Amino acid sequence: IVGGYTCGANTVPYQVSLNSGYHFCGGSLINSQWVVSAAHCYKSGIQVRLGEDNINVVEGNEQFISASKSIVHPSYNSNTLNNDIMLIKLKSAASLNSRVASISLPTSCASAGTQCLISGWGNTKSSGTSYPDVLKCLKAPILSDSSCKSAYPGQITSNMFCAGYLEGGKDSCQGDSGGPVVCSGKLQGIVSWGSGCAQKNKPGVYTKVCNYVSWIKQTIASN
Ligand SMILES: NC(=[NH2+])c1ccc2[nH]c(-c3cccc(-c4ccccc4)c3[O-])cc2c1
Ligand SMILES: [Ca+2]
Ligand SMILES: [Cl-]
């Protein structure tokens, strides 16, 4: 997260770190046995780490659970990143409490202007790599479809939305992919891609979760 602030330990209880010996992506806990992340974060050997703040220190509240299966959306396109969503089923359910909680899926899509919270352990520099130990947060608004399409002509599908600041300075970045974009208590997006990080007129692009709720529900109900 570039231009954000330190969240404060366990203030984002639905945030998870996907780990394979190092942190490579974020994700969101939506119930006690399922996590939603981005399809491009898929790999084998995933350990899901819940209740984290400093990802390099066991401070207490952590729960490390292996993924039993990861379900990449069947129409995921790795060239356009269209349908960049994945569901991960945990080997055992997690113990929910005030430090580990799930986030609700939305019933409707959000409108431009909506203020959301984006978080993660990704790079905090736009020009260079500085990875934090604790979780960073950024409050950012959803942009209108026209500004998004004018920024990325021909690359935005109906399953994506832009959020951020066109003046540059604040954005999600590498290491944040797969994580949450929460607006009014509902998970509206998943960190997907962007051109550089925090560059002028190149906002972050997110997977539009409201378009996949029936798919998430039906898939979880059958697995
Ligand atoms: N400007 C943004 N808003 C933004 C958001 C998420 C991002 N993720 C990345 C990213 C960069 C290199 C590798 C990965 C990656 C690749 C495979 C698996 C996991 C992460 C990224 O997600 C860049 C990147 C940029
Ligand atoms: Ca820790
Ligand atoms: Cl277009």
Number of strands: 13
Number of helices: 2
H/E series: EEEEEEEEEHEEEEH
Q: Describe the sheet with the most strands.
A: 7 strands, antiparallel
Can you name the CATH architecture of the largest domain?
Beta Barrel
The helix fraction, in percent, is under 10%
User: Tell me, what is the CATH class of the largest domain?
Assistant: Mainly Beta
* Structural class assignment: mainly beta
The spatial strand order of the largest sheet comes to 1-9-8-11-12-13-10
Distance between the termini: 33 Å
- What's the number of domains? 2
Task: Tell me the strand percentage band.
Answer: 25-35%
Say which CATH homologous superfamily of the largest domain is assigned.
Answer: Trypsin-like serine proteases
Anisotropy-based shape: globular
Report the C-alpha radius of gyration, rounded.
16 Å
Question: How is the CATH topology of the largest domain named?
Answer: Thrombin, subunit H
Task: Write structural notes for this entry.
By secondary structure, the chain is mainly beta. The protein folds into 2 domains: 1-12 and 103-210, Beta Barrel (Thrombin, subunit H); 13-102 and 211-223, Trypsin-like serine proteases (Thrombin, subunit H). It has 2 helices and 13 strands. It is globular and about 45 Å long. The protein starts with a strand and ends with a helix. The ligand NC(=[NH2+])c1ccc2[nH]c(-c3cccc(-c4ccccc4)c3[O-])cc2c1 is lined by residues 24-25, 40-41, 171-174, 176-177, 191, 193-194, 197, 204. Disulfide bonds join 7-137, 25-41, 109-210, 116-183, 148-162, 173-197. Belongs to the peptidase S1 family. Its cofactor is Ca(2+).
